[PDB]
């Protein structure tokens, strides 16, 4: 049972919009919207979306496993050894938000202050004393972006696993000599850093120049969660506000995916005429180039939707029905929709590019979609008494911590290691006003709901 | 009753070190150390200090008022109008942490997300609708450091008031025409930005080239809090760990101030021989140039303590008894004292340069001294039922908010406006492990105390 199995199981359920059935439904943690800061829904005038892992949630482990295979195939074709072909994606290893230390070749799970929670070199989990050899203070400076790369997106899950597979393979292959900062193969030295760069380049290539998009679109049922409640929720949002799409993807891909997500023999509700995905949006913007989008952005372009090419020149005209934009900036959206930042609820899965930057740069309200939560909630609930045991204790503490963490996977929970919260968890609490396993959970709350969080008090104020 | 009156009242009290008298004492909020994150004192191997507003707490409003007078005198001498001489420092206006908007000439009190809590143009407090004219989303991008300057230090209190005095004077003087971004005086245009720069330059000049230091040192009793418990606490720290001083000040000034702080006819306890301030430190570093100190730093120099000049050249020798260093970096301290970051408790008043940067860059443990807390606690306690009233209500809400805030001053509490926490309050919670009105409050806790904060849980985990 992957998180996308949980999500698709929920998607297969028709909507019962009886006011009491809705209240009853959002009692289950799985269908709730979780609140970091209060948000009066009646003040929200525009709902904005990212596509990838928001509207189009890719099925797991199938989509990660396809990315992994194509990245491996790309590395082998540029001259990495044949043995790479014998790797197979393992969804029980990677947790999102890990840091790759490019100097020493370690994956690290860290808290918000750069304290090390987990260190693995390949598939060897390094304990306390040995980690102090490389990290004397058990601490990394995460502003050292040349050395440390944070694998924060769901697109980075295959490469998280692949980095560990590579370190493991080269360490154990007698053709290579292991050094502190990489591997010697006779007169060739491959540093962890240049290995990491090859991996990152091959992932980029696979998405932009390779076969990933082609293979996705030829089997959408296999790769993409589909839900009859999607048109229903978007149509209800459009009744009370404007709705926009701002995606990094190009028009052709977006049109293929979105067509699929809306491909029902009815519109919003069963019985209603089907309508094209585009009619659900007051504004559609592709090639957004987020996070730059939330600063200077790029020049505003117009898509020729017949060819899928951009028209030549900067677009200087008004918002017209049927027009599709490319590039631009967050100010474009505000100007064209007549919105102030605080009137906008922006819905995305990228805790940096989407959510952090629209909050810090523009004061947008934010809803983070966290697909893994659909399964982390099930673990959190039926290891209730394991965390409670941990909480009661403050040697047994390290053991309980370990067994709590293993229930999630080899790299533990997205949100913690025992009683120590992750960097990812702290970015969520600080920058996501609202969050959930799916934005569909909004359907379970009335139009003008006040999501409420308790007022925060300092220690001297308590 | 200023906060430094509270502090000096407490300093005049001899230490009763009876174990039960200590427990009883730290029951009072005024003598407590407040905990944002747990800290086992037994793990602390080095205690590090800043001097200014930490060891040497300048008396208020006297010291601010002296800075204000000398800054005014400096502005007048470079050609600002004579009317400036009729300004008088008013300690009831400025609150620390305000933002000066150099485009529009406003002081702003903001939360951690850049939302505006208070806007004043000169001495006119601008209400909701009028503020939306300049701040359509009631929001500033605080990463716009060219436009916005944050007045975060106690040294910035005189200039906070002076900026408002200047805007007020030029607005109401018929020689000048008020414009959106400054003042026209015939064929001369003075922008708020260049006015701000003049003020900032004159404050800098007053500290580095003017008479502020001279006037301080000629009347130390008037300007600097002195406490017999200081030598006592430092001596107790030295029994269990190393103690260091790392200050931005030069040697001559530091020697004058520190000599005064230790000028008792006894050492640590009454009855004991007096010892020189320098014997209380395993390492003394002046001209630290923080915050750069916590990165590359500067070249390590040696002070010639006879002349107060630097010896010529980079110092390459060991830590020797009696040596005084200049410049260097945080790594110098760690290397010479044989400390890891987490073994260090760094004690300072600058929530950015001291505390933020040693935490983020080096993983040091942090103790923030917040002098105003010595008085904000007294207001928090006897407006108990005013905040409680505010808490019960969630038009009356705006009124209660206003009357709560006025008890603190015109720009309200350092920590909030009603139920909305300030940027400053959020920087404290996130980067200060421990905080208090004075670091002397450490004297009330045993050697190996565990300061404890409850574990943090996300909303879905609660
Ligand atoms: O969260 C962030 O975006 C940064 C910046 O904080 P601000 O200076 O923008 O408040 O804090 P970090 O997590 O790196 O300590």
UniProtKB/Swiss-Prot annotation, chains A, B:
Single biological process term from Gene Ontology: adenosine metabolic process
Tissue: Widely expressed.
Keyword list, A-Z: Allosteric enzyme, ATP-binding, Cytoplasm, Disease variant, Hereditary spastic paraplegia, Hydrolase, Magnesium, Metal-binding, Neurodegeneration, Nucleotide metabolism, Nucleotide-binding, Phosphoprotein, Transferase
Residues annotated as binding IMP: 50, 52, 200, 204, 213, 247-249, 290
Positions that bind dATP: 142, 152, 427, 430
Residue ranges of coiled coil: none
Details of cofactor binding: Binds 1 Mg(2+) ion per subunit.
Residues annotated for GMP binding in this entry: 50, 52, 200, 204, 213, 247-248, 290
GO CC aspect terms: cytoplasm; cytosol
Ligand binding (Mg(2+)): 50, 52, 349
Protein residues bound to adenosine 1: 152, 427
Outcome recorded upon mutating residue 434 to P: In SPG45; uncertain significance
Main subcellular location: cytoplasm
Binding-site residues for adenosine 2, renumbered to this chain: 410
Activity regulation description: Allosterically activated by various compounds including ATP, 2,3-BPG/2,3-Bisphosphoglyceric acid and Ap4A/P1,P4-bis(5'-adenosyl) tetraphosphate. Binding of an allosteric activator is a prerequisiste to magnesium and substrate binding. Inhibited by inorganic phosphate.
GO MF assignments: 5'-nucleotidase activity; ATP binding; GMP 5'-nucleotidase activity; identical protein binding; IMP 5'-nucleotidase activity; metal ion binding; nucleoside phosphotransferase activity; ubiquitin protein ligase activity
Record CDD domains: HAD_cN-II
Pfam family, one: 5_nucleotid
Cell compartments where the protein resides: Cytoplasm, Cytosol
Residues annotated as binding (2R)-2,3-bisphosphoglycerate: 142, 360, 431
Subunit structure: Homotetramer.
Family the entry assigns: Belongs to the 5'(3')-deoxyribonucleotidase family.
Implicated disorder: Spastic paraplegia 45, autosomal recessive: A form of spastic paraplegia, a neurodegenerative disorder characterized by a slow, gradual, progressive weakness and spasticity of the lower limbs. Rate of progression and the severity of symptoms are quite variable. Initial symptoms may include difficulty with balance, weakness and stiffness in the legs, muscle spasms, and dragging the toes when walking. In some forms of the disorder, bladder symptoms (such as incontinence) may appear, or the weakness and stiffness may spread to other parts of the body.
Protein's UniProt name: Cytosolic purine 5'-nucleotidase
Record organism: Homo sapiens
């Amino acid at each position: 049972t992957s998180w996308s199995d949980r999500l698709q199981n929920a998607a297969d359920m028709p909507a019962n919009m009886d006011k009491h059935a809705l209240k009853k439904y959002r009692r289950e943690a799985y269908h709730r919207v979780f609140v970091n800061r209060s948000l009066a829904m009646e003040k929200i005038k525009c709902f904005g979306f990212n596509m990838d892992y928001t509207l189009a949630v890719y099925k797991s482990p199938e989509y990660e496993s396809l990315g992994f295979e194509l990245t491996v195939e790309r590395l082998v074709s540029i001259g990495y050894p044949q043995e790479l072909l014998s790797f197979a994606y393992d969804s029980t290893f990677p947790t999102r938000g890990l840091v790759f230390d490019t100097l020493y070749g370690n994956l690290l799970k860290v808290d918000a202050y750069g304290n090390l929670l987990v260190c693995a070199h390949g598939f060897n989990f390094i304990r306390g004393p040995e980690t102090r050899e490389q990290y004397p203070n058990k601490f990394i400076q995460r502003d050292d972006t040349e050395r440390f790369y944070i694998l924060n997106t769901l697109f980075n899950l295959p490469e998280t696993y692949l980095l560990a597979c590579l370190v493991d393979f080269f360490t154990n292959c007698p053709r290579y000599t292991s050094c502190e900062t990489g591997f010697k193969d006779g007169d060739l030295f491959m540093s962890y850093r240049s290995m990491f760069q090859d991996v990152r380049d091959a992932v980029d290539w696979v998405h932009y120049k390779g076969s990933l998009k082609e293979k996705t679109v030829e089997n959408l049922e296999k790769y993409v969660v589909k839900d009859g409640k999607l048109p229903l929720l978007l149509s209800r949002m459009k009744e009370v506000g404007k709705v926009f799409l701002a995606t990094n993807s190009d028009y052709k891909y977006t049109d293929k995916i979105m067509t699929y997500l809306f491909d029902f023999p009815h519109g919003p509700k069963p019985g209603s005429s089907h309508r094209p995905w585009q009619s659900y949006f007051d504004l559609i913007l592709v090639d957004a180039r987020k996070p730059l989008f939330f600063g200077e952005g790029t020049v505003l372009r117009q898509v020729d939707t017949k060819t899928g090419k951009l028209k030549i020149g900067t677009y200087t005209g008004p918002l017209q029905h049927g027009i599709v934009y490319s590039g631009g900036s967050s100010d474009t959206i505000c100007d064209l929709l007549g919105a102030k930042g605080k009137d906008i609820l922006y819905i995305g899965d990228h805790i940096f590019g989407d959510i952090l930057k629209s909050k810090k740069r523009q004061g947008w309200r934010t809803f983070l979609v966290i697909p893994e939560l659909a399964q982390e909630l099930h673990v959190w609930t039926d290891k209730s008494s394991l965390f409670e045991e941990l909480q009661s204790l403050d040697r047994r503490i390290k053991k309980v911590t370990h067994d709590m963490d293993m229930c999630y996977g080899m790299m533990g929970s997205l949100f913690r290691s025992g009683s120590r919260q992750t960097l990812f968890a702290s970015q969520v609490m600080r920058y996501a006003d609202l969050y959930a396993a799916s934005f569909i959970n909004l359907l379970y709350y009335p139009f003008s709901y006040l999501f409420r969080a308790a007022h925060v008090l300092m220690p001297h104020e308590s």
